[PDB]
Amino acid sequence: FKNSTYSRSSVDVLYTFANCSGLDLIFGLNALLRTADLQWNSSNAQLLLDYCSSKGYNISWELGNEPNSFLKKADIFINGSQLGEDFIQLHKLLRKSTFKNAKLYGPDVGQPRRKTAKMLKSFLKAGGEVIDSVTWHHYYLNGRTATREDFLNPDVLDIFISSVQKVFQVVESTRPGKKVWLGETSSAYGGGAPLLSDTFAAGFMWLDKLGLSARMGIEVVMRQVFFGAGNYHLVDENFDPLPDYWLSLLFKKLVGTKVLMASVQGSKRRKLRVYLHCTNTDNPRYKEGDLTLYAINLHNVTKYLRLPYPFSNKQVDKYLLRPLGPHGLLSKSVQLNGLTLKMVDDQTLPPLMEKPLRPGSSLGLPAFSYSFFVIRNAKVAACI
Amino acid sequence: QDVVDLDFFTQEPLHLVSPSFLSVTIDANLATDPRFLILLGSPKLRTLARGLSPAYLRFGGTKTDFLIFDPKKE
Ligand SMILES: *[C@@H]1[C@H](O)[C@@H](O)[C@H](OCCNC(=O)C(F)(F)F)[C@@H](C(=O)O)[C@H]1O
Ligand SMILES: *[C@@H]1O[C@H](CO)[C@@H](O)[C@H](O)[C@H]1NC(C)=O
Ligand SMILES: *[C@@H]1O[C@H](CO)[C@@H](O)[C@H](O)[C@H]1NC(C)=O
Ligand SMILES: *[C@@H]1O[C@H](CO)[C@@H](O)[C@H](O)[C@H]1NC(C)=O
């Protein structure tokens, strides 16, 4: 990996993309610019900070990506304590800038294996006070070796739980109460798994990641990537949306910020995976108190879900996703309730149409699928 | 049979995620693409991006730690 420069022009393109799309830009600063005694040399960043403040750019900051593999990536080792010190230096430069309330996030470590756990714990002892969120990264598989079976395997989904618990163990012991973010996450590292990371099959891992992240106290999940060379892109090379874009848009329209819990009665509770939030109230069709249930069926037959008292006879909208043939779970096209999802034109996302179910009917979820169910007039006080 | 009973906990929220819970990255490597300017210019891509609002956009990657800011460069 060689150095590369970038222009004010690039900073401007990036920023207006973010700005004009209604997204909050987070910019990662080079943490491998060091002084003689392996402190962070901050003068380049000091320049970029100046340029950005001049232009009126509202921007949040990170410093470094996967510091845990700097030795492999650059034959430089930086330990957590130093990196924490490097983050206090950056916080200072930000306090003495024009957005002095600019947010700082870090340290964007890989999944918590023993070496990475040690790095993150010493980073938080030292620099914990100045970060607004702890960022770490998760990947289920190696993009080079991942198989279609791995993408469908609940033993693979389940590993994420352990990773989350290890991160929360480090954080509760150094900075109790600090927000925890996934700062870079995907099905598979090495740019994703060809013919898998870009397909309907990718949606099992993505929806499960979101469900478990919310349930276990992760506040923000950052998807590698919105767009890029990587098979894990939400949007392909021709700016066409892949099944995960649509999953993401559906989730965004239906799922609220208030996290609840759902679970299956029984000992087999591995292949049928269920999540429960308050319905997104900004959804014009729904009202305060409504529930959003979402469910993943990795069984090879339809399952029929029965809502408990007092929700057993409520009106339910289904939003079931299913691949458009002929390539089944390897398809790059998806249908919502039997209707193919396609942009109306370059400027126009289609409607996302519910299928009202007969009140009192069980929730049919076919083999290898995922669906949202909105429980209308649930009147859940914790939501209102 | 394939009928499955759900238990629901609804007494209080167990957690509050950000309105921006489902957020996205652009890899730092994409600033080394000759076509970078055309790609983020795309009206079509802007439409798709706006659909995920609100969201954080993280500009970051392996290349984060190999990118030097040049106030001169065109
Ligand atoms: C995290 C790391 O920060 C990423 O830079 C890295 O992505 C590699 C290349 N990705 C692309 O250029 C893109 F965006 F996909 F087109 C990933 C990874 O291994 O996939 C991860 O280590
Ligand atoms: C940091 O880098 C800049 C030029 O790259 C230089 O002005 C400054 O003296 C450096 N400090 C070091 C290497 O300690
Ligand atoms: C970590 O690295 C710093 C800076 O290189 C060094 O001075 C120190 O001995 C190390 N700290 C610990 C706790 O090992
Ligand atoms: C379906 O899954 C079962 C496990 O419930 C498995 O043993 C069986 O061979 C699979 N295929 C079909 C179509 O039943």
CATH at residue A17:
3.20.20.80
The answer to whether A91 and A103 are in contact (CB under 8 A) is no
Distance CA B49, CA B61 (A): 19
CA–centroid distance, B12 to ligand 2, in Å, is 54
CA distances from A320 to A207, A250, A275, A342, A366 (A): 13, 10, 15, 16, 9
Cβ contacts of B67 within 8 Å, gap of 6 or more:
A3, A4, A5, A6, A30, B28, B31
**Residues of A with Cβ-Cβ distance to B74 under 8 angstroms:** 7, 9
Across the interface, whether the CB atoms of A220 and B18 are under 8 A apart is answered yes
CB of residue A79 inside a 6 A radius of ligand 3: yes
Q: Flag whether B65 is marked binding.
A: no
Distance CA A76, CA A301 (A): 52
The answer to whether A374 and A314 are in contact (CB under 8 A) is no
Token couple for A213: 């992240």
Ligand 2 atom at minimum distance from A39 CA: 14
- Between CA A106 and CA A118, with CA A112 as vertex, the angle to 5 degrees is 75
Sheet bearing B3-9, strands edge to edge:
A261-264, B3-9, A303-306, A363-365
Distance CA A169, CA A279 (A): 31
Tell me the angle at which helices A202-216 and A154-172 cross, rounded to the nearest 10 degrees. 30
Is-catalytic flag, A85?
no
What single letter denotes the amino acid at residue A276? L
Token couple for A42: 């901050």
Rg (CA), chain A: 22
CB of residue B55 inside a 6 A radius of ligand 1: no
Q: How far is A125 from chain B (nearest CA, A)?
A: 23
SS3 track for chain A: CCCEEECHHHHHHHHHHHHHHCEEEEEEECCCCECCCCCECCHHHHHHHHHHHHCCCCCEEEECCCHHHHHHHHCCCCCHHHHHHHHHHHHHHHHCCCCCCCCEEEEEECCCCHHHHHHHHHHHHHHHHHCCEEEEEEEEEECCCCCHHHHHCHHHHHHHHHHHHHHHHHHHCCCCCCCEEEEEEEEEECCCCCCCCCCCCHHHHHHHHHHHHHHHCCCEEEECCCECCCCCCCECCCCCECHHHHHHHHHHHHEEEEECEEEECCCCCCCEEEEEEEECCCCCCCCCCCEEEEEEECCCCCEEEECCCCCCCCCEEEEEEEECCCCHHHCCCEEECCEECCCCECCECCCCCCEECCCCCCEEECCCEEEEEEECCCCCCCCC
Domain that holds residue A254: 8-259
> Which among B56, B66, B68, B73 is the top mutation candidate for probing chain A, defined by the most A β-carbons within 10 Å of its own β-carbon?
B56
Unique residue bearing structure tokens 């929220």: B13
Distance CA A193, CA A231 (A): 6
Instruction: State the structure-solving technique.
Output: X-ray
Q: How far is B35 from chain A (nearest CA, A)?
A: 11
- Between CA A69 and CA A77, with CA A75 as vertex, the angle to 5 degrees is 60
Outline where B3-68 has alpha helix (H).
36-41, 43-50
| Per-domain residue ranges of chain B | 1-74
Distance CA A261, CA A214 (A): 10
CB of residue B29 inside a 6 A radius of ligand 1: yes
Unique residue bearing structure tokens 């960043």: A45
Token couple for B28: 């730092």
The residue whose CA has the least distance to atom 7 of ligand 3 is: A82
CA A264 to chain CA centroid, nearest Å: 25
The answer to whether B22 and B52 are in contact (CB under 8 A) is yes
Q: Is the peptide bond before A154 cis (omega within 30 degrees of 0)?
A: no
| CA end-to-end distance (rounded Å), chain A | 52
Taking residue A153's Cβ as centre, other Cβ atoms within 10 Å add up to 19
Phi and psi angles of residue A325, each rounded to the nearest 5 degrees, phi first: -65, 175
> Strand B67-69 and strand A4-6: pairing?
parallel
Across the interface, whether the CB atoms of A23 and B25 are under 8 A apart is answered no
CB of residue A82 inside a 6 A radius of ligand 3: yes
Determine the 3-state secondary structure of B9 from DSSP: strand
Taking residue B36's Cβ as centre, other Cβ atoms within 10 Å add up to 17
Taking residue A217's Cβ as centre, other Cβ atoms within 10 Å add up to 17
The answer to whether A138 and A212 are in contact (CB under 8 A) is no
Partner residues linked to A363 by β-bridges: A305
> Which among B8, B20, B32 is the top mutation candidate for probing chain A, defined by the most A β-carbons within 10 Å of its own β-carbon?
B8
Is-catalytic flag, A184?
yes
Distance CA A150, CA A146 (A): 6
